[PDB]
RNA sequence: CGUCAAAGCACUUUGCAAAAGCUAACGUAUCUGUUUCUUGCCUUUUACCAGAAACAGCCGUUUGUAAGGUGUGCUAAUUUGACUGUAUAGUUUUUGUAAUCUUUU
C-alpha cells in the first residue's frame, strides 16, 4: 500500500530524525515543520561527522539543495 | 494588451509643392476645344457626320509640407512610432555536485 513523500514527512514531523547532506554530514534532531520543497527544520540537533558529535547548536533550518537523506531514530 | 520615444489632440481654412521610378483604374466617373489627316451630308463660311494621330483645356482625386481657424486639454488627453515583451527555487541554461587536498613540469 503506497507511502509518498509529502504523507511521509506530514507523519514524520515531531518525532527523532536523522537527515545526511551531499557532503557527509549527518544531523539528528526532532522536526517542527515541513514545506512544500521538503526544505527542513530542526530543534536541538547535534552534528554528527563521520559517527561523532561535534557542536551542539540547537534551533536549525537547512536549505533543501543539499539534503541527500530522510529517515528515522 | 504591455513597455520606451516623440508629439498637445481631434475637427477644420488657405498657401506652396509634388502624383507610371518594375504594365497600370491619380477618376471602377467622363466632356469641350485646337492642329494634321482621312471619309460623310453639302455649296455660303460658320454650325455639323464619325474614325485616326499630336497636342490642349475643364469638372474632380491623393499625398507631403507651412501657416492658421473651432472644440478641448497645456496640475492632462490623444495620436504616432519603436521594441531581443511574460514570472519557472523540484531533471536540458538564472537559487549551484559544490567544497577541499596532493603530486608532476
Avoid: H
Wanted: charged content about 20%.
Amino acid at each position: 500500500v503506497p507511502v509518498n513523500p509529502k504523507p511521509f514527512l506530514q507523519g514524520l514531523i515531531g518525532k527523532p530524525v536523522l537527515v545526511r547532506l551531499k557532503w557527509g554530514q549527518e544531523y539528528k534532531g526532532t522536526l517542527q515543520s515541513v514545506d512544500s520543497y521538503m526544505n527542513l527544520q530542526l530543534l536541538n540537533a547535534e552534528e554528527l561527522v563521520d559517527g561523532v558529535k561535534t557542536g551542539d547548536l540547537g534551533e536549525i533550518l537547512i536549505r533543501c539543495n543539499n539534503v541527500l537523506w530522510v529517515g528515522e531514530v
